[PDB]
């Protein structure tokens with residue numbers, strides 16, 4: 001197979017290495033949310049921001065030995081008004097209220113941490129029982145944000161990577177692995 | 188119009204416009220040094236769809252330049268009618284960062300959706316945030332939001348007209364009154 | 371007030387209200403005996419955010435009971451400008467199946483987004499579907515969809531006022547005029 | 554187990570699902586062998602299916618998601634909570650469904666996307682029920698034809714639960 005002949009210069013994470021780590025995260029999450037959630041009577045809620053972390057959440061929930069529910073949000077940026085925001089525009093809000101719920105924010109990659117900071121603070125205002133963050137990838141510039149990511153899959157260098165949900169102009173998401181683009185693509 | 192549905196007229200069309208002209212004049216004076224000081228005008232944020240009739244008259248009563256902004260929200264439970272947490276179906280079109288913002292309501296009853304809205308918009312970091320409502324019920328007088336501009340203080344009866352509805356009707360009324368028999 | 375922004379005034383506030391007053395009676399006569407026969411009211415569907423100021427005056431000019439509906443639409447870019455296919459940010463709150471619906475626009479320029487919109491609402495199978503716009507540009511007479519009610523015929527120039535904007539400004543004007551290109 | 558006493562019988566096992574998706578991916582890849590194949594998915598039942606489907610399709614695929622709500626208790630007209638991010642003009646579009654039962658929401662959707670004038674528009678569903686024979690849509694790709702019983706698992710839910718199941722099975726009537 002191939003799909004994108006030459007666009008991928010180097011391979012950061014292989015497909016097996018990704019799935020192996022996800023299996024580890026599931027057991028870890030499964031142990032942290034064992035006892036509690038199934039007795040509470042309300043499952044572990046997985047809130048996902050469209051649409052990079054869709055491939056990640058489908059594998060994660062099936063890696064978590066505890067029953068999990070899905071929830072999806074669609075957000076867009078208010079343009080360049082990012083730097084002093086970090087407020088993002090909501091295109092599709094939560095379907096139901098998350099009051100008294102154990103909620104796990106599932107992202108695929110955390111770079112700046114500003115859209116995540118607003119999202120995490122936004123969900124907190126809805127008063128859930130628990131709120132933690134699980135990301136597949138974390139880049140160096142996340143150390144400059146104020147949010148604690150309880151579950152991290154991989155710490156990668158500050159390079160633009162695609163694959164496994166990660167895109168460049170809506171492409172390379174269907175890749176099973178995560179790698180770096182070859183700069184003769186940006187044109 | 189609506190024969191035999193309207194029992195009494197609480198507020199006439201004349202009383203509404205007279206107050207809005209007065210309310211508009213008050214707001215226009217409070218936000219007078221805004222064009223010359225920031226240069227972004229006063230933003231009127233409106234929640235669909237009751238206060239749509241009110242803002243069109245309110246903004247045209249305010250002598251200083253005003254901008255329009257609309258939100259569409261829905262109730263979850265049980266959740267809203269106790270928490271005040273509301274669902275967003277349409278967020279703001281632009282960022283209100285560093286803006287002088289006026290939340291324009293048609294009626295404030297419990298004051299919790301207003302509480303959630305005011306707290307939500309605050310996270311967007313505006314320069315100033317005040318609330319202007321046309322009607323105010325008794326339970327709102329003791330809520331967690333400060334309403335700088337109030338049009339009328341009304342008793343807690345279910346009233347329709349001037350944007351206020353019952354099953355999407357009576358919105359087009361120019362006066363505000365109460366329903367009676369088999370409605 | 372906008373002291374150095376309005377070069378010329380195309381339509382005065384009196385002329386605007388006069389046509390709307392005429393349109394309300396005209397629409398009111400075309401939709402006479404509708405509530406008592408169907409059992410439903412005339413639904414006014416509005417596209418945010420130009421015709422929001424227009425419908426509040428239009429509905430209050432129509433002597434028969436009317437209901438409100440609002441849509442928020444966005445451009446895909448490139449493809450809207452030449453297709454007219456638009457993104458939906460806010461759909462109708464209720465279904466319009468078997469309803470007599472009046473599409474209310476603020477201005478009809480190309481007629482491409484209106485044509486797509488008309489087809490979208492038609493697929494929901496309403497009883498009737500007509501279009502009422504306050505302003506119509508010369509190149510809008512071109513093709514597709516019947517605009518049953520037109521308030522004014524304006525030249526194809528960019529005008530602001532009475533809901534019409536330039537970067538969310540000049541909306542609060544009671545009149546419709548032309549901007550000075552040094553804006 | 555995951556839900557002790559809720560799953561009475563297993564209709565399709567996890568391995569049987571992935572094996573069939575592998576065939577669907579291979580079949581679709583040959584039919585669409587100019588940009589990428591656009592996979593339009595309706596939130597949120599078919600999210601587990603499309604992620605596995607796209608990784609089964611040997612040709613490059615792009616993702617798109619819609620959120621729709623029902624107006625109530627006829628024509629398949631649904632309220633749009635989340636529209637497409639981009640226009641699909643001249644695009645090869647594949648509608649990815651989780652289950653096709655009545656075929657009424659799919660028909661409104663298929664006709665709606667057709668109005669955006671794509672180059673191609675096809676429908677791929679994992680499961681199809683017997684009453685779909687009366688639908689208005691031609692479904693080119695079907696994973697399984699299942700009986701008219703209420704099934705959960707692999708995206709399919711009951712009060713937002715059992716979505717995380719890797720298999721598809723039937724519920725225990727002391728759940729309703």
Ligand SMILES: Nc1nc2c(ncn2[C@@H]2CN(C(=O)CCP(=O)(O)O)C[C@H]2OC[C@@H](O)P(=O)(O)O)c(=O)[nH]1
Pocket residue numbers: 050051052053109110111112113114115116117159160161162163165166167168
């Ligand atoms: N492909 C790809 N994207 C990245 C990367 N890094 C940041 N992105 C996207 C750009 N970005 C930010 O700059 C904000 C980081 P944070 O606020 O911490 O979530 C969010 C990242 O997700 C892109 C979303 O728009 P999407 O899921 O809809 O595609 C990266 O290495 N690779």
Ligand SMILES: Nc1nc2c(ncn2[C@@H]2CN(C(=O)CCP(=O)(O)O)C[C@H]2OC[C@@H](O)P(=O)(O)O)c(=O)[nH]1
Pocket residue numbers: 234235236237238294295296297298299300301327344345346347348350351352353
């Ligand atoms: N007709 C009509 N309605 C009222 C009244 N009072 C509260 N409503 C509606 C119910 N309500 C609240 O409970 C909010 C109270 P707060 O805590 O201050 O946010 C606001 C009104 O909701 C109607 C909106 O859905 P709408 O804008 O789409 O019409 C009232 O006198 N008369």
Ligand SMILES: Nc1nc2c(ncn2[C@@H]2CN(C(=O)CCP(=O)(O)O)C[C@H]2OC[C@@H](O)P(=O)(O)O)c(=O)[nH]1
Pocket residue numbers: 417418419420421454475476477478479480481482483484485510527528529530534535536
């Ligand atoms: N201010 C101001 N705008 C104009 C004018 N003319 C076309 N516009 C905007 C561009 N336009 C179209 O191309 C519509 C084509 P049709 O399918 O016939 O409805 C409508 C106007 O768009 C602005 C609305 O989205 P808005 O209400 O959110 O501001 C004009 O004189 N003056």
Ligand SMILES: Nc1nc2c(ncn2[C@@H]2CN(C(=O)CCP(=O)(O)O)C[C@H]2OC[C@@H](O)P(=O)(O)O)c(=O)[nH]1
Pocket residue numbers: 595596597598599629651652653654655656657658659660702703704705709710711
């Ligand atoms: N759990 C579970 N659901 C089913 C089943 N069957 C139909 N559903 C849901 C209800 N349904 C239909 O009756 C078919 C309508 P059409 O598109 O015309 O074929 C679509 C199914 O999806 C429900 C969505 O609200 P969801 O994706 O958010 O879960 C079934 O066996 N099991």
Ligand SMILES: [Mg+2]
Pocket residue numbers: 052166167168
């Ligand atoms: Mg991206």
Ligand SMILES: [Mg+2]
Pocket residue numbers: 237351352353
């Ligand atoms: Mg109401």
Ligand SMILES: [Mg+2]
Pocket residue numbers: 420534535536
């Ligand atoms: Mg405009």
Ligand SMILES: [Mg+2]
Pocket residue numbers: 598709710711
């Ligand atoms: Mg379901």
